[PDB]
Amino acid sequence: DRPRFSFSIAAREGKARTGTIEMKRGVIRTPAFMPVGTAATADIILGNTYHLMLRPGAERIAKLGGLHSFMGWDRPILTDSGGYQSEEGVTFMLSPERSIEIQHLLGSDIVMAFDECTPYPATPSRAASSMERSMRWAKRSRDAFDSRKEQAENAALFGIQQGSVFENLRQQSADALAEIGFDGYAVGGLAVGEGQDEMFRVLDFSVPMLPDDKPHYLMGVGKPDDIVGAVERGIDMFDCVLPTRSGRNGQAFTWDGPINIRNARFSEDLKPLDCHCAVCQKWSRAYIHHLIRAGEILGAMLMTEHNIAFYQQLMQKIRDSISEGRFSQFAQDFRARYFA
Amino acid sequence: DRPRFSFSIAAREGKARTGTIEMKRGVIRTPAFMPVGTAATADIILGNTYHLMLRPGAERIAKLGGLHSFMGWDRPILTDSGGYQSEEGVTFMLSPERSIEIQHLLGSDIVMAFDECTPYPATPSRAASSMERSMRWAKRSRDAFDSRKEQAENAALFGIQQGSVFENLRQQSADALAEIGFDGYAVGGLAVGEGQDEMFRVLDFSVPMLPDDKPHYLMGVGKPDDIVGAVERGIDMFDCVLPTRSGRNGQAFTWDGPINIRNARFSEDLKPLDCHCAVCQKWSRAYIHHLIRAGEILGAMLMTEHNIAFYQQLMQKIRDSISEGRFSQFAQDFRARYFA
Ligand SMILES: [Zn+2]
Ligand SMILES: [Zn+2]
């Protein structure tokens, strides 16, 4: 039987790491991409806390046996805390205590502390006030989590760093989070419209502030090139709505960049979408083009499956190249071809 | 190597038959349900002639290698003739000759003659004039089909009976079609809003007019109970948009009748949709309810897969019970439970 939570780093290259998170429901290979569980029929999937508490409701999910039984997914599940107004929480009611209990009822394996994702841009004073409240909320999340024996003994809790783009606030947040103590640490408050250069700049000083021996989760990121750059800066875990969102709107990710398959230039293109996935085996660009142009749900479903599969192939190549000490070369080859 | 076209009846019960159509691309077990090929990832599928000639166009499909390569389906394909205004054809241009050539370019295995599907209701004089033109068009379809060696030697041609609800016109149409000679015979002009009692009434006298030793295809039908009743009256082949249409709109077919899965009574129902299909294995009514209510494409896709699978399980039970001489009992048990 695996432990509740064990992170081990198998290989490093510069700031990049590769390794495994062991949990009771399975092993997560890192760097990891964590897709939304409702995308299609990955070592871990995401549950949509905010949606689930509104429909059918966390208590109803609990009565139906929890998210694992509900979704037919017996491997780990991560839930966000739902925050993405007062010291107690937010009314719209949601608080650190209520957020933790909701995630408990859903049965998730990785529980996010309840935070306040600072808007961008933000003054230093606003970013500081928001970070300080998130740190008080992180301590309340820790305590609520620890009060529930089933949760404390079988789940894991991640703290979320805030502080906007300010190095001194990011440092203070990391210090507060480490002193409380969490199983993993998320870099929050990015992917809120800052642009890639700025995000990378903030990651450059922010990730080393976190405990090196714990997983680092960059919330909301991102495009394939965002992921490569963030692994280069020490991120271990990723979630992003892009692969599933893009699939509905006609956008496919390939090693040569994203393409819009609805474009007329693909109407007679017999090459597959890119790739090893089942879609790229049997289906041409031309046929997927046709399905999507015709409004057929099969088209969107095949596009979504390809995009999900592409992200996992990307993460596999990242893990292998770090393990083999050629990630720097991989990142360089990836960007030359992706932006060609 | 199989023949171009061979229909053999293995067992009969009353007017019902069960058997096989052998074609070069495979064997079709009858009675057969023929789903639209673009529904999901059946012994034969349907191509949408009218749509395909508009996008991307029949010549473009031919340049891409034909429908089999285009869709990744190496088994038989049936295409309708596109008719569903003058003696030459219809402008909107489509004629018996053009319809046959389009179906040739698409590469379909079973080719429908170009007909005029009489509107309902229709006076005897209108039904007669329309049937008479369809019979002239059927002879032109035969000749065009026979002029193309690749088509005549590798495909099959079905004639379509018309005549509305009038026994004397149905008889005249069957006579004209048999004298021309076709590989199979469709009963056309039903499922146009006549209601099940009327359709069954017309089938009662119309199907025995067709050659007994050739397959009988009831176009556009239908609901599961329509199919059972039409097999009881000697139909061998079916197509219907219902299983794929219903899946998008929340309707699932079950042995206890159709249900609308969006209905709140399914929000905590842990039973599967019905069934042996992959959906009914892993997925509860409650989770599919949730997916569809949330607008998730996965929900519609799972509903469509279930409906397609249900129709094929229905056809398998029909074939087995005819083969075992218990179809009359099956039909009775089916209706008692389906309408309970
Ligand atoms: Zn692919
Ligand atoms: Zn099923």
Short mmCIF file of N, CA and C in Angstrom, two decimals, chain A residues 12 18 39 64 120 135 151 154 228 258 321:
data_model
loop_
_atom_site.label_atom_id
_atom_site.label_comp_id
_atom_site.label_asym_id
_atom_site.label_seq_id
_atom_site.Cartn_x
_atom_site.Cartn_y
_atom_site.Cartn_z
N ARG A 12 17.33 15.65 -12.16
CA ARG A 12 17.26 17.10 -12.26
C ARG A 12 18.11 17.56 -13.44
N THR A 18 12.27 15.83 -12.41
CA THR A 18 11.32 14.81 -12.78
C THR A 18 11.30 13.77 -11.68
N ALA A 39 -13.57 15.93 -19.51
CA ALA A 39 -13.20 16.23 -20.89
C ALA A 39 -13.47 15.04 -21.81
N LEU A 64 -23.93 10.14 -3.55
CA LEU A 64 -23.69 9.26 -4.69
C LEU A 64 -22.38 8.50 -4.60
N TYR A 120 -4.93 41.23 -11.59
CA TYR A 120 -3.80 41.83 -12.28
C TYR A 120 -4.27 42.95 -13.22
N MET A 135 -2.80 34.16 3.34
CA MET A 135 -1.98 33.42 4.29
C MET A 135 -2.77 33.09 5.56
N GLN A 151 -9.87 12.87 5.92
CA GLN A 151 -9.15 13.73 5.00
C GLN A 151 -7.67 13.81 5.37
N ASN A 154 -5.80 10.45 4.47
CA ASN A 154 -5.86 9.87 3.13
C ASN A 154 -5.67 10.87 2.00
N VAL A 228 6.67 24.25 -21.08
CA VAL A 228 8.10 23.98 -21.23
C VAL A 228 8.91 24.99 -20.44
N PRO A 258 -0.08 25.50 -32.94
CA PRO A 258 -1.52 25.29 -33.03
C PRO A 258 -2.03 25.61 -34.43
N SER A 321 13.27 13.55 -21.26
CA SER A 321 14.47 14.33 -21.55
C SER A 321 15.14 14.84 -20.27
#
